[PDB]
Amino acid sequence: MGEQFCVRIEKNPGLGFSISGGISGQGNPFKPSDKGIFVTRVQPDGPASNLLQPGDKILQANGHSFVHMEHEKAVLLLKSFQNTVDLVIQRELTGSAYGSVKAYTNFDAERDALNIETAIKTKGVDEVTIVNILTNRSNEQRQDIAFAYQRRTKKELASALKSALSGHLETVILGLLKTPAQYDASELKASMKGLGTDEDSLIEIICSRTNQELQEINRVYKEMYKTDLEKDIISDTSGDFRKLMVALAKGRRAEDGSVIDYELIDQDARDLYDAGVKRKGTDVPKWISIMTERSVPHLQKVFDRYKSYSPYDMLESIRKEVKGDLENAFLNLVQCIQNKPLYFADRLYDSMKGKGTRDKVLIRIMVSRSEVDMLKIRSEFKRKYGKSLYYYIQQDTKGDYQKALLYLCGGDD
Ligand SMILES: [Ca+2]
Ligand SMILES: [Ca+2]
Ligand SMILES: [Ca+2]
Ligand SMILES: [Ca+2]
């Protein structure tokens, strides 16, 4: 028998976890046939760290039974509870093999594929079911579902959904079906097809992805297009902007070991100052070398130490020293080093704050960060803007497209 635990979470500003499931059949990435409400992601340095774990089933929250609850009501209740939430949790007994709570089987993939086929082919197309299933499974499970779908229908799932869907919802769903590396590779290819119209997407991806992520992107890009990503970047960029993006795309940044090199932190800070604000012009290769080669924790401390020498911080110094695509690239890079979840929170705010929506940016971030740091993004967003990321999506989008984005958000804050 599973064990029931009592857990108290202090919001700061949210609960630091996401949920999936519900009585309407969303499923979840752990026990999809169980209709309960499941914890899916837990923010590692957050309010629920070392209290909740992925796969935990919520039985009760602040005196409300969560057995036989709709997903949207669970989202509402957990967000609406003030300050402190007392949960009753059901957790399966596990040993050294941590990952056994994810009991997703090959038949789960078959049943998911069958239910998606039924939704695709029913009168009017059942977009609610398609969105409910695919946004409440992991990316790995979506690969399993697509394989099972083709085995049953002799037709590719992506092709069937392209015919059944349209508009922004089609963009979201087709993006979710690709592996993380496939999605980034295809977004990079799309950005270089314009050749000067969408450097923002190239900059966003290349500046924010880690060594391991860029290694896989480079491999998958070559497999998908029979061309080296570096060669297409060179053909798409020029000047020092080309040099910066080529260096970043190699994904050969130093990884920070166990020792903080305080002497090098000070020397890098002085070198960045001497190469820019202190002198006429700019020594751009020095900026490129330091900001692409040093580890991220090292550069976080470098940028702080830089403020000891310079009247302007690193971001303001960039705006004073360089212009154009090069300036944009440096500003994005420094934000990604300083606080990557805040970087994406600001980009999400920018994509929705004004008239209409920059749907291309909103979709790309919600898809690509849904299984990386969405909870950290949500925390920074709520702390800065006062309302949740969920709230902004709710006000800027509508219909099944809105619902898909809200599922990728993982909950309200
Ligand atoms: Ca419909
Ligand atoms: Ca279509
Ligand atoms: Ca200067
Ligand atoms: Ca708007």
UniProtKB/Swiss-Prot annotation:
**PTM text:** Phosphorylation of Tyr-98 enhances heat stress-induced translocation to the cell surface. ISGylated.
Residues that the record marks as modified (Phosphotyrosine) are 98, 273
Q: Where is this cross-link: Glycyl lysine isopeptide (Lys-Gly) (interchain with G-Cter in SUMO2)?
A: 123
Output the GO biological process annotations, alphabetical, semicolon-separated: angiogenesis; cell-matrix adhesion; collagen fibril organization; epithelial cell apoptotic process; fibrinolysis; lung development; membrane raft assembly; mRNA transcription by RNA polymerase II
Mark the residues carrying the PTM N6-acetyllysine: 123, 226, 301
Just give the chief location class: secreted
| Gene Ontology MF, one | RNA binding
**Other comments?**
It may cross-link plasma membrane phospholipids with actin and the cytoskeleton and be involved with exocytosis.
Q: State the name under which the record lists this protein.
A: Annexin A2
The organism of origin for this protein: Homo sapiens
Encoding gene, per UniProt annotation: ANXA2
